[PDB]
Design an enzyme around this catalytic site. Structure first.
Site, short mmCIF file in Angstrom:
data_model
loop_
_atom_site.label_atom_id
_atom_site.label_comp_id
_atom_site.label_asym_id
_atom_site.label_seq_id
_atom_site.Cartn_x
_atom_site.Cartn_y
_atom_site.Cartn_z
N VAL A 26 0.84 -1.19 0.00
CA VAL A 26 0.00 0.00 0.00
C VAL A 26 0.88 1.25 0.00
O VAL A 26 0.46 2.31 -0.45
CB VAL A 26 -0.95 0.01 1.22
CG1 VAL A 26 -0.18 -0.24 2.49
CG2 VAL A 26 -1.68 1.34 1.31
N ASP A 157 2.67 8.69 12.19
CA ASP A 157 4.08 9.05 12.25
C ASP A 157 4.56 10.17 13.15
O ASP A 157 5.13 11.14 12.67
CB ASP A 157 4.59 9.33 10.83
CG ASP A 157 4.44 8.14 9.91
OD1 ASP A 157 4.40 7.00 10.42
OD2 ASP A 157 4.37 8.34 8.68
F1 LIG Z 1 1.44 -0.49 13.16
C1 LIG Z 1 1.46 0.29 12.10
C2 LIG Z 1 1.90 1.65 12.24
C3 LIG Z 1 1.92 2.50 11.09
C4 LIG Z 1 1.50 2.02 9.81
C5 LIG Z 1 1.53 3.00 8.62
N1 LIG Z 1 2.63 3.66 8.31
N2 LIG Z 1 2.36 4.43 7.25
C6 LIG Z 1 1.10 4.29 6.83
C7 LIG Z 1 0.50 3.36 7.69
C8 LIG Z 1 -0.94 2.92 7.55
C9 LIG Z 1 -1.52 2.59 6.25
C10 LIG Z 1 -2.89 2.17 6.16
N3 LIG Z 1 -3.73 2.06 7.25
C11 LIG Z 1 -3.24 2.36 8.51
C12 LIG Z 1 -1.81 2.81 8.72
C13 LIG Z 1 1.06 0.64 9.69
C14 LIG Z 1 1.04 -0.22 10.84
#
Ligand SMILES: Fc1ccc(-c2n[nH]cc2-c2ccncc2)cc1
Ligand SMILES: Fc1ccc(-c2n[nH]cc2-c2ccncc2)cc1
Length: 327
Positions: A26, A157
Protein backbone atom coordinates in the site's frame (compact mmCIF):
# COMPACT_ATOMS: atom_id res chain seq x y z
CA UNK A 1 4.45 -19.15 19.50
CA UNK A 2 2.41 -18.69 16.28
CA UNK A 3 3.25 -20.20 12.89
CA UNK A 4 4.85 -17.81 10.41
CA UNK A 5 4.96 -18.02 6.62
CA UNK A 6 7.44 -16.39 4.25
CA UNK A 7 6.87 -14.50 0.99
CA UNK A 8 8.43 -11.75 -1.10
CA UNK A 9 6.73 -8.51 -2.12
CA UNK A 10 8.54 -5.78 -4.08
CA UNK A 11 11.99 -7.19 -3.33
CA UNK A 12 11.05 -7.11 0.35
CA UNK A 13 10.81 -10.28 2.43
CA UNK A 14 7.78 -10.62 4.68
CA UNK A 15 7.54 -13.20 7.45
CA UNK A 16 4.27 -12.93 9.34
CA UNK A 17 1.97 -15.16 11.44
CA UNK A 18 -0.53 -17.09 9.30
CA UNK A 19 -3.39 -15.23 10.99
CA UNK A 20 -2.52 -12.39 8.62
CA UNK A 21 -3.53 -13.23 5.06
CA UNK A 22 -3.76 -11.59 1.66
CA UNK A 23 -0.85 -9.19 2.11
CA UNK A 24 -0.70 -6.48 -0.53
CA UNK A 25 1.56 -3.39 -0.67
CA UNK A 26 0.00 0.00 0.00
CA UNK A 27 3.02 2.23 0.52
CA UNK A 28 6.22 2.97 2.44
CA UNK A 29 9.70 0.75 6.32
CA UNK A 30 7.08 -0.88 4.11
CA UNK A 31 3.34 -1.24 4.68
CA UNK A 32 0.99 -3.99 3.51
CA UNK A 33 -2.77 -4.12 3.70
CA UNK A 34 -3.88 -7.51 5.04
CA UNK A 35 -6.75 -9.48 6.51
CA UNK A 36 -6.61 -10.60 10.13
CA UNK A 37 -8.29 -14.01 10.31
CA UNK A 38 -8.31 -13.95 14.11
CA UNK A 39 -10.18 -10.63 14.45
CA UNK A 40 -11.78 -10.66 11.01
CA UNK A 41 -10.57 -7.13 10.33
CA UNK A 42 -8.57 -5.39 7.64
CA UNK A 43 -5.25 -4.22 9.04
CA UNK A 44 -2.07 -2.51 7.98
CA UNK A 45 1.25 -4.26 8.61
CA UNK A 46 4.42 -2.20 8.64
CA UNK A 47 7.86 -3.78 8.46
CA UNK A 48 10.67 -1.57 9.74
CA UNK A 49 13.44 -1.27 7.15
CA UNK A 50 16.67 -1.92 9.04
CA UNK A 51 15.52 -1.51 12.67
CA UNK A 52 19.08 -1.94 13.94
CA UNK A 53 21.40 -0.65 11.19
CA UNK A 54 22.94 1.83 13.63
CA UNK A 55 22.57 3.23 17.14
CA UNK A 56 20.31 5.88 15.62
CA UNK A 57 18.16 3.26 13.87
CA UNK A 58 18.08 1.11 16.97
CA UNK A 59 16.95 3.98 19.19
CA UNK A 60 14.48 5.15 16.52
CA UNK A 61 13.07 1.63 16.38
CA UNK A 62 12.69 1.63 20.16
CA UNK A 63 11.13 5.10 20.14
CA UNK A 64 8.47 4.21 17.57
CA UNK A 65 7.50 0.97 19.33
CA UNK A 66 7.24 2.77 22.69
CA UNK A 67 5.14 5.55 21.15
CA UNK A 68 2.75 3.18 19.34
CA UNK A 69 2.24 0.97 22.39
CA UNK A 70 1.30 4.05 24.37
CA UNK A 71 -1.17 5.67 21.95
CA UNK A 72 -4.70 4.52 22.78
CA UNK A 73 -7.05 7.06 21.22
CA UNK A 74 -9.64 7.01 18.44
CA UNK A 75 -7.82 9.70 16.45
CA UNK A 76 -4.32 8.29 16.83
CA UNK A 77 -2.71 5.24 15.26
CA UNK A 78 -2.63 2.49 17.86
CA UNK A 79 -1.12 -0.99 18.04
CA UNK A 80 -3.25 -4.05 17.35
CA UNK A 81 -0.16 -6.22 17.37
CA UNK A 82 3.62 -6.22 17.15
CA UNK A 83 5.69 -9.27 16.28
CA UNK A 84 8.97 -10.71 15.03
CA UNK A 85 9.73 -14.08 13.46
CA UNK A 86 12.76 -14.40 15.76
CA UNK A 87 12.48 -17.07 18.45
CA UNK A 88 15.14 -15.38 20.59
CA UNK A 89 16.86 -12.05 21.22
CA UNK A 90 19.92 -13.56 19.57
CA UNK A 91 18.30 -13.70 16.14
CA UNK A 92 16.00 -10.71 16.69
CA UNK A 93 16.50 -8.48 13.63
CA UNK A 94 13.02 -7.71 12.29
CA UNK A 95 10.05 -5.82 13.64
CA UNK A 96 6.49 -5.74 12.34
CA UNK A 97 3.81 -3.32 13.51
CA UNK A 98 0.08 -3.90 13.05
CA UNK A 99 -2.80 -1.40 13.14
CA UNK A 100 -6.34 -0.94 11.76
CA UNK A 101 -6.28 -0.44 8.02
CA UNK A 102 -7.06 3.13 6.97
CA UNK A 103 -8.19 3.63 3.39
CA UNK A 104 -6.37 6.83 2.44
CA UNK A 105 -4.92 10.11 3.66
CA UNK A 106 -5.68 13.84 3.37
CA UNK A 107 -2.95 14.28 0.81
CA UNK A 108 -5.09 11.95 -1.32
CA UNK A 109 -8.60 13.33 -0.79
CA UNK A 110 -8.12 16.89 -2.03
CA UNK A 111 -13.94 20.09 0.73
CA UNK A 112 -16.99 21.85 2.14
CA UNK A 113 -16.94 23.69 5.46
CA UNK A 114 -18.77 20.90 7.26
CA UNK A 115 -16.19 18.34 6.19
CA UNK A 116 -13.30 20.59 7.16
CA UNK A 117 -14.87 21.06 10.59
CA UNK A 118 -15.11 17.33 11.27
CA UNK A 119 -11.62 16.60 9.95
CA UNK A 120 -9.81 19.43 11.77
CA UNK A 121 -11.87 18.61 14.87
CA UNK A 122 -10.49 15.06 14.82
CA UNK A 123 -6.92 16.20 14.31
CA UNK A 124 -7.22 18.53 17.28
CA UNK A 125 -8.85 15.84 19.37
CA UNK A 126 -5.94 13.53 18.58
CA UNK A 127 -3.40 16.30 19.16
CA UNK A 128 -4.83 17.16 22.58
CA UNK A 129 -4.27 13.58 23.67
CA UNK A 130 -0.77 13.41 22.19
CA UNK A 131 0.21 16.78 23.69
CA UNK A 132 -1.13 15.83 27.11
CA UNK A 133 1.52 13.08 27.09
CA UNK A 134 4.24 15.67 26.57
CA UNK A 135 4.70 14.37 23.04
CA UNK A 136 5.11 16.67 20.05
CA UNK A 137 4.34 15.31 16.60
CA UNK A 138 6.69 17.73 14.81
CA UNK A 139 5.77 16.63 11.29
CA UNK A 140 2.02 16.90 10.87
CA UNK A 141 1.10 17.02 7.19
CA UNK A 142 -1.71 15.71 4.93
CA UNK A 143 0.14 12.48 4.17
CA UNK A 144 0.44 11.78 7.93
CA UNK A 145 -3.30 12.01 8.41
CA UNK A 146 -5.04 8.70 7.67
CA UNK A 147 -8.76 8.62 6.91
CA UNK A 148 -11.20 5.80 6.21
CA UNK A 149 -14.48 5.75 4.26
CA UNK A 150 -16.39 7.15 7.25
CA UNK A 151 -14.16 10.24 7.17
CA UNK A 152 -12.80 8.95 10.50
CA UNK A 153 -9.27 10.28 10.95
CA UNK A 154 -6.11 9.16 12.76
CA UNK A 155 -2.74 10.83 13.22
CA UNK A 156 0.28 8.90 11.93
CA UNK A 157 4.08 9.05 12.25
CA UNK A 158 4.82 11.06 15.39
CA UNK A 159 8.47 10.63 14.39
CA UNK A 160 8.13 18.17 4.02
CA UNK A 161 8.60 21.88 4.71
CA UNK A 162 5.29 23.49 3.78
CA UNK A 163 3.62 22.77 7.15
CA UNK A 164 6.61 23.48 9.42
CA UNK A 165 6.33 26.17 12.09
CA UNK A 166 8.41 29.31 11.37
CA UNK A 167 10.44 28.98 14.59
CA UNK A 168 11.52 25.63 13.17
CA UNK A 169 12.33 27.16 9.79
CA UNK A 170 14.76 29.20 11.88
CA UNK A 171 16.87 27.01 14.16
CA UNK A 172 15.15 27.52 17.49
CA UNK A 173 16.09 24.64 19.77
CA UNK A 174 13.30 25.32 22.26
CA UNK A 175 10.18 25.12 20.15
CA UNK A 176 7.22 23.56 21.93
CA UNK A 177 4.02 21.63 21.14
CA UNK A 178 2.50 24.68 19.47
CA UNK A 179 4.54 23.88 16.38
CA UNK A 180 1.88 21.21 15.76
CA UNK A 181 -0.90 23.79 15.95
CA UNK A 182 0.81 25.79 13.22
CA UNK A 183 0.79 22.72 10.99
CA UNK A 184 -2.92 22.24 11.64
CA UNK A 185 -3.48 25.84 10.61
CA UNK A 186 -1.68 25.23 7.32
CA UNK A 187 -3.62 22.01 6.79
CA UNK A 188 -7.00 23.58 7.54
CA UNK A 189 -6.29 26.48 5.19
CA UNK A 190 -5.35 23.98 2.48
CA UNK A 191 -8.58 22.03 2.94
CA UNK A 192 -10.60 25.24 2.65
CA UNK A 193 -8.90 26.74 -0.40
CA UNK A 194 -7.57 23.64 -2.12
CA UNK A 195 -4.10 25.18 -2.31
CA UNK A 196 -0.93 24.76 -0.27
CA UNK A 197 -0.89 27.80 2.00
CA UNK A 198 2.92 28.17 2.07
CA UNK A 199 4.60 26.20 -0.77
CA UNK A 200 8.16 27.25 0.06
CA UNK A 201 10.97 26.17 -2.27
CA UNK A 202 13.46 26.21 0.61
CA UNK A 203 13.97 27.38 4.20
CA UNK A 204 14.42 30.97 3.02
CA UNK A 205 11.52 30.96 0.57
CA UNK A 206 9.27 29.16 3.07
CA UNK A 207 9.83 31.73 5.80
CA UNK A 208 9.44 34.51 3.26
CA UNK A 209 5.99 33.23 2.32
CA UNK A 210 4.95 32.88 5.96
CA UNK A 211 5.83 36.45 6.91
CA UNK A 212 3.98 37.82 3.88
CA UNK A 213 0.76 36.55 5.42
CA UNK A 214 1.37 36.90 9.16
CA UNK A 215 3.59 39.96 8.84
CA UNK A 216 7.16 40.32 10.08
CA UNK A 217 8.05 39.84 13.80
CA UNK A 218 6.97 42.61 16.15
CA UNK A 219 9.07 43.99 19.00
CA UNK A 220 7.81 41.58 21.65
CA UNK A 221 8.74 38.51 19.57
CA UNK A 222 11.98 40.09 18.38
CA UNK A 223 13.01 40.28 22.06
CA UNK A 224 12.81 36.49 22.33
CA UNK A 225 15.41 35.76 19.65
CA UNK A 226 18.88 34.99 21.06
CA UNK A 227 20.58 34.20 17.75
CA UNK A 228 22.37 37.22 16.31
CA UNK A 229 22.41 35.76 12.80
CA UNK A 230 18.73 34.93 13.12
CA UNK A 231 18.10 38.58 14.05
CA UNK A 232 20.27 39.99 11.26
CA UNK A 233 18.53 37.79 8.73
CA UNK A 234 15.01 38.48 10.04
CA UNK A 235 15.48 42.18 10.80
CA UNK A 236 17.00 42.81 7.37
CA UNK A 237 14.04 41.46 5.41
CA UNK A 238 11.54 43.97 4.05
CA UNK A 239 9.20 44.74 6.94
CA UNK A 240 5.68 43.49 6.25
CA UNK A 241 2.37 43.83 8.13
CA UNK A 242 0.06 41.01 9.21
CA UNK A 243 -2.64 40.64 6.58
CA UNK A 244 -6.38 40.71 7.10
CA UNK A 245 -7.33 37.04 7.11
CA UNK A 246 -10.93 37.98 6.38
CA UNK A 247 -9.76 39.33 3.03
CA UNK A 248 -7.21 36.61 2.33
CA UNK A 249 -9.70 33.80 3.01
CA UNK A 250 -12.76 35.83 2.01
CA UNK A 251 -15.84 33.74 1.32
CA UNK A 252 -14.85 31.14 3.89
CA UNK A 253 -16.82 30.56 7.09
CA UNK A 254 -16.02 33.58 9.33
CA UNK A 255 -15.64 31.16 12.23
CA UNK A 256 -13.02 29.20 10.29
CA UNK A 257 -11.20 32.47 9.63
CA UNK A 258 -11.22 33.34 13.32
CA UNK A 259 -9.69 30.00 14.28
CA UNK A 260 -7.04 30.28 11.56
CA UNK A 261 -5.84 33.63 12.86
CA UNK A 262 -5.51 32.06 16.31
CA UNK A 263 -3.52 29.12 14.96
CA UNK A 264 -1.28 30.88 12.46
CA UNK A 265 0.23 33.31 14.98
CA UNK A 266 3.94 33.98 14.50
CA UNK A 267 4.84 34.04 18.20
CA UNK A 268 4.47 30.45 19.45
CA UNK A 269 3.66 31.67 22.97
CA UNK A 270 0.51 33.31 21.54
CA UNK A 271 -0.84 30.34 19.54
CA UNK A 272 -4.06 28.68 20.58
CA UNK A 273 -3.51 25.22 22.06
CA UNK A 274 -5.20 22.05 20.89
CA UNK A 275 -7.33 21.99 24.05
CA UNK A 276 -8.49 25.57 23.55
CA UNK A 277 -9.15 25.05 19.84
CA UNK A 278 -11.53 22.19 20.50
CA UNK A 279 -13.61 24.70 22.48
CA UNK A 280 -13.65 27.24 19.63
CA UNK A 281 -17.14 27.91 18.21
CA UNK A 282 -16.16 26.50 14.81
CA UNK A 283 -16.49 23.05 16.39
CA UNK A 284 -19.73 23.77 18.24
CA UNK A 285 -21.42 20.84 16.50
CA UNK A 286 -18.71 18.34 17.49
CA UNK A 287 -17.16 19.61 20.73
CA UNK A 288 -17.76 17.54 23.89
CA UNK A 289 -15.56 18.19 26.97
CA UNK A 290 -16.48 14.76 28.34
CA UNK A 291 -15.32 13.00 25.18
CA UNK A 292 -11.89 14.53 24.45
CA UNK A 293 -9.61 12.39 26.71
CA UNK A 294 -6.02 12.98 27.77
CA UNK A 295 -3.29 10.34 27.85
CA UNK A 296 -1.58 8.60 30.74
CA UNK A 297 2.00 9.69 31.53
CA UNK A 298 4.59 8.79 28.87
CA UNK A 299 8.14 8.15 30.02
CA UNK A 300 10.51 9.92 27.61
CA UNK A 301 13.57 9.58 29.85
CA UNK A 302 15.15 7.11 27.40
CA UNK A 303 15.52 9.94 24.90
CA UNK A 304 18.46 11.33 26.87
CA UNK A 305 20.24 7.98 27.12
CA UNK A 306 23.31 6.98 25.12
CA UNK A 307 23.18 3.20 24.81
CA UNK A 308 24.75 0.46 22.68
CA UNK A 309 22.94 -1.04 19.68
CA UNK A 310 22.51 -4.32 21.53
CA UNK A 311 20.98 -2.50 24.47
CA UNK A 312 18.44 -0.63 22.32
CA UNK A 313 17.71 -3.88 20.50
CA UNK A 314 17.25 -5.81 23.74
CA UNK A 315 15.12 -2.95 25.05
CA UNK A 316 12.97 -3.18 21.93
CA UNK A 317 12.78 -6.97 22.14
CA UNK A 318 11.51 -6.64 25.71
CA UNK A 319 8.81 -4.24 24.53
CA UNK A 320 7.68 -6.73 21.87
CA UNK A 321 7.36 -9.57 24.37
CA UNK A 322 5.56 -7.43 26.95
CA UNK A 323 2.97 -6.31 24.41
CA UNK A 324 -0.61 -7.09 25.38
CA UNK A 325 -3.23 -6.90 22.59
CA UNK A 326 -6.06 -4.37 23.03
CA UNK A 327 -9.39 -5.43 24.59
F1 LIG B 1 1.44 -0.49 13.16
C1 LIG B 1 1.46 0.29 12.10
C2 LIG B 1 1.90 1.65 12.24
C3 LIG B 1 1.92 2.50 11.09
C4 LIG B 1 1.50 2.02 9.81
C5 LIG B 1 1.53 3.00 8.62
N1 LIG B 1 2.63 3.66 8.31
N2 LIG B 1 2.36 4.43 7.25
C6 LIG B 1 1.10 4.29 6.83
C7 LIG B 1 0.50 3.36 7.69
C8 LIG B 1 -0.94 2.92 7.55
C9 LIG B 1 -1.52 2.59 6.25
C10 LIG B 1 -2.89 2.17 6.16
N3 LIG B 1 -3.73 2.06 7.25
C11 LIG B 1 -3.24 2.36 8.51
C12 LIG B 1 -1.81 2.81 8.72
C13 LIG B 1 1.06 0.64 9.69
C14 LIG B 1 1.04 -0.22 10.84
F1 LIG C 1 10.66 35.37 11.90
C1 LIG C 1 10.28 34.69 12.95
C2 LIG C 1 9.49 33.46 12.79
C3 LIG C 1 9.06 32.72 13.97
C4 LIG C 1 9.42 33.19 15.30
C5 LIG C 1 8.97 32.42 16.55
N1 LIG C 1 7.69 32.08 16.79
N2 LIG C 1 7.65 31.42 17.96
C6 LIG C 1 8.87 31.31 18.51
C7 LIG C 1 9.80 31.94 17.64
C8 LIG C 1 11.30 32.00 17.94
C9 LIG C 1 12.32 31.81 16.89
C10 LIG C 1 13.73 31.88 17.23
N3 LIG C 1 14.19 32.13 18.52
C11 LIG C 1 13.27 32.32 19.54
C12 LIG C 1 11.77 32.27 19.31
C13 LIG C 1 10.22 34.43 15.41
C14 LIG C 1 10.64 35.17 14.26
Amino acid sequence: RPTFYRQELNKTIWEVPERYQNLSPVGSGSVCAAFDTKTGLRVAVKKLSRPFQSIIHAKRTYRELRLLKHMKHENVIGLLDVFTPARSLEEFNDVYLVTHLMGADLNNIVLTDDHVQFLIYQILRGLKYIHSADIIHRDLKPSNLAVNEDCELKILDFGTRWYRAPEIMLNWMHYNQTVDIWSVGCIMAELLTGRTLFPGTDHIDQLKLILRLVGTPGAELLKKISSESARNYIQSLTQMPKMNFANVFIGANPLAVDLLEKMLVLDSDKRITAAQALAHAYFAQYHDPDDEPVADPYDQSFESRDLLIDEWKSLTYDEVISFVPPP
